Spike glycoprotein (Severe acute respiratory syndrome coronavirus 2), 115 residues
Amino acid sequence: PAICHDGKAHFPREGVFVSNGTHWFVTQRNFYEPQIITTDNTFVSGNCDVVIGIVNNTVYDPLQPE
Amino acid sequence: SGWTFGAGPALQIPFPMQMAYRFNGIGVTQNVLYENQKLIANQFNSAIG
Ligand SMILES: *[C@@H]1O[C@H](CO)[C@@H](O)[C@H](O)[C@H]1NC(C)=O
């Protein structure tokens, strides 16, 4: 349901979180088209202690490298 | 399977995520459900009872 990066829960803006077995992606619901979980695809609202089923992973920031 | 079985092949999906989709369909963001999941369940169980 949600991905915890650093003490914060991230929910998909429009799509679902899927995994092939080793890595996590975000995709549509009616067609398979995986993408990289960045700060654009997701929005943050929470504290990483109330969602039942949260998992640990890393999101990517498109501004830190530049 | 949600509403998928009425259009094409049936596709399974966990119930809380289907409920999140149903909330998202009426204009309330899904994070409202997950942070108030247990409470909502109770309000359903009483309503049937
Ligand atoms: C997720 O990460 C946090 C902090 O790194 C850690 O405390 C917690 O045990 C981790 N949870 C799992 C299921 O690995």
